[PDB]
Each structure stands twice: as C-alpha cells, then as structure tokens.
Chains A and B, each alone.
Chain A
Amino acid sequence: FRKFTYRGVDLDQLLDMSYEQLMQLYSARQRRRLSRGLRRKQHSLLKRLRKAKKEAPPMEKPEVVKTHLRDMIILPEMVGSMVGVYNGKTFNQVEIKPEMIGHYLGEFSITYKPVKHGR
C-alpha cells in the first residue's frame, strides 16, 4: 500500500508548481531543457502542445493527439495524455504516469525498428 514516489513533491504539488521552483526539481539535463524560458520561433509549438495539453477528453481512455516533437518533455502536467510520438514509420502510444516524468517523449519511442539477425 504505497503510491507513485517522486523526490518529495506529489502529483497535485507537481501539477500546481511555479516554473522557477520546477527548475530545481528535475535533473540538469532537464533543468537547462526548461531554464531558458519562452520561445518566439516555431518552438511556440511546445506552447501549442501545452495549449493541446488542455484537450483532456471526457471520462474515457483519452484520445491520441499527435506530437512531431521528440524533444517534448514528460511533464507531470501531461500525466493523463495518450500521445502520438512519430518515429519515421509508426506513432507510438504508451500510457503515461508519475513514474515516466522528467524524461523526453522520444525516449519511449523507437526511431529504429528492433534489430534481428538472419544468416
């Protein structure tokens, strides 16, 4: 009888945390992923995936809305989003959780088809 175990910050504490206390929570590989702040170029698509992060459908296994951004982070805000992470052939669909978090989407996607040797 134990839940998901993060650092010392629960999922309600994760969902509602300011974006400068959030900077001192995950690894330096993920700190400087989200230290620089806002974006003005096509990287306003992460904003548009935050905008599409509020596409939480009614009580159901949630739908797959696609992301062609493998640099998109497993944010704890996202938890409850079936995801379309493209890998050159097939859009993967792995259900997300507090365990996944502080990691990139492209990790849980196989860009290269699994290798098997013949003769």
Chain B
Amino acid sequence: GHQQLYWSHPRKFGQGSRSCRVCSNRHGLIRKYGLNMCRQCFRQYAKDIGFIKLD
C-alpha cells in the first residue's frame, strides 16, 4: 500500500533508473567502459584511474 508503492518505477532503463557511484546524481554518467561516473568527478579522479591528457 505504501511499501509496494515505494519502488514502483520499472528501474531497468532511463538516466533516473541508473545512478552515479560517487555522488548519486542522475546526469552525465560515463557509460563508456562502464566508468558509470558523474563527468565532474571523472575529471578530478581520472589522474589515479590512468586517463591522462598525453595529447
């Protein structure tokens, strides 16, 4: 009644269905190579992932 009407979205597609791993924000997820990262956090912490602007 409340509990069944608490998670009643089909949560298998849409930018709202997925979520960020750092921030839990529903915009700008890097869905290339399954980084699944808010682009603002990717920028900061890509230095210690291995992504470096060599060119």
Contacts and interface: CB of A to CB of B under 8 A. Distances in A.
A47 to B, nearest CB: 16
Interface residues of B, number: 2
Contacts of A42: 5, 8
Interface string B1-33: 000010010000000000000000000000000
Nearest to A41: B8
B53 to A, nearest CB: 47
A41 B5 CA distance: 10
Nearest to B5: A42
Contacts of A41: 8
A24 B8 CA distance: 32
Chain A to chain B: the 3 pairs with minimum beta-carbon distance, closest first: A42-B8, A41-B8, A42-B5
3 contacts: A41-B8, A42-B5, A42-B8
